[PDB]
Design a protein around this ligand. Sequence first.
Ligand code: ADP
Ligand code: MG
Ligand code: MG
Lengths: 160, 96, 70, 50, 43
Amino acid sequence: MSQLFNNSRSDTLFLGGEKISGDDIRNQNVLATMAVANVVKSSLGPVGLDKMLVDDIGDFTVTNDGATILSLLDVQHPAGKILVELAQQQDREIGDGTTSVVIIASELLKRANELVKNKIHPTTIITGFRVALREAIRFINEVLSTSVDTLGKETLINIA
Amino acid sequence: SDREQLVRAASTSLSSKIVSQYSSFLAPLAVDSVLKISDENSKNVDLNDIRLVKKVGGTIDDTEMIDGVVLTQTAIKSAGGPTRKEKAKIGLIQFQ
Amino acid sequence: HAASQMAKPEDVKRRSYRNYGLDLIRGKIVDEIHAGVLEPTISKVKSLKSALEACVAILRIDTMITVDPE
Amino acid sequence: MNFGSQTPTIVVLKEGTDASQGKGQIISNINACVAVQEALKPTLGPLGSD
Amino acid sequence: PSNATFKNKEKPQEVRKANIIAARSVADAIRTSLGPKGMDKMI
Ligand SMILES: Nc1ncnc2c1ncn2[C@@H]1O[C@H](COP(=O)(O)OP(=O)(O)O)[C@@H](O)[C@H]1O
Ligand SMILES: [Mg+2]
Ligand SMILES: [Mg+2]
């Protein structure tokens, strides 16, 4: 979505790459998130379908997991590396929901960027998510269900 | 030795950055970790006596206080050695 | 789901709704208990927290600075 | 029977003709209009910029 | 008046102006990182 690249500035001289500010950064960060979120969006659920990635030596890898497909996608952008390492943190800890946690984070950065354009501060936005998540975990405790009156290993079978 | 002004004074600096919603129990953690451990009165108060262990994985809420020292290193386990030992005396081997 | 949350505590049928939802094979609303769709509670716990910290890390960024390699 | 060693396949469209299927192009077209929209966003109003 | 000291040098005040603008350029880069409403900077 970003066009017309930022001009090289003579008043601010920093060694290396040029500095860029404003709303273009959060637009570029969300645009970098959609580059990886659209990849994993199709391979979600039973009806979801996956893709192939070649290793430039004839070999390839048909991958369903979010941690594996992002591990081979070496993201040069800094914001994408956070989600790449998150899936490597997700699959090692729990081993489930690797595709959903990236999809949840992508949708959050979408609407969070829309809220910043609506002129509320990110600190109030982060406070809104934390108080909401604290009530969400409290609601997850309410909707629990203890396994009872089940014949044999049926609860372990159907959950697998 | 006042847990009222020292705790809320530390939360003012934590609020100007990340990690501030969980500062309600990290603010008093900072108070006791310096006044009651490093030095009590003046002139000497050191930060090298504080240790922070970096680790990937987990959540922000998992950070908690440990009453004793923690070792960043891990066991060899190569040989089949113990990895826990209740009521064990720790000896520092400074040779090979 | 809304018709279930709003409901009286004393309403069996409505409460049950709180329990079911989307089906991807047949394309209709059926019970998850009879269908067998189930997950652990630990899978959702600490998943939104990781997504929350992932959102916080990028959302708080204002400017981007890049240093070229030597 | 054949005229030569091999016979490379024909591309249906002309070489260099860009084409794409699916919902990606219409999102790119909408994002292209939003990119032009952002230039005129702060201009609107009696307190806008040239 | 005509007897005033011209001082022969305008290069020093020009170099000081170039340093102040260069110092204010990076100072204005991190102005929005102050307070609870500050923003992070990933480098
Ligand atoms: N048979 C099924 N019926 C309904 N929903 C399902 C079924 N199988 C999987 N799902 C849903 O698909 C989502 C993702 O599942 P899966 O792809 O196995 O995990 P991951 O997101 O880690 O790849 C889950 O949140 C789950 O609710
Ligand atoms: Mg799965
Ligand atoms: Mg401070």
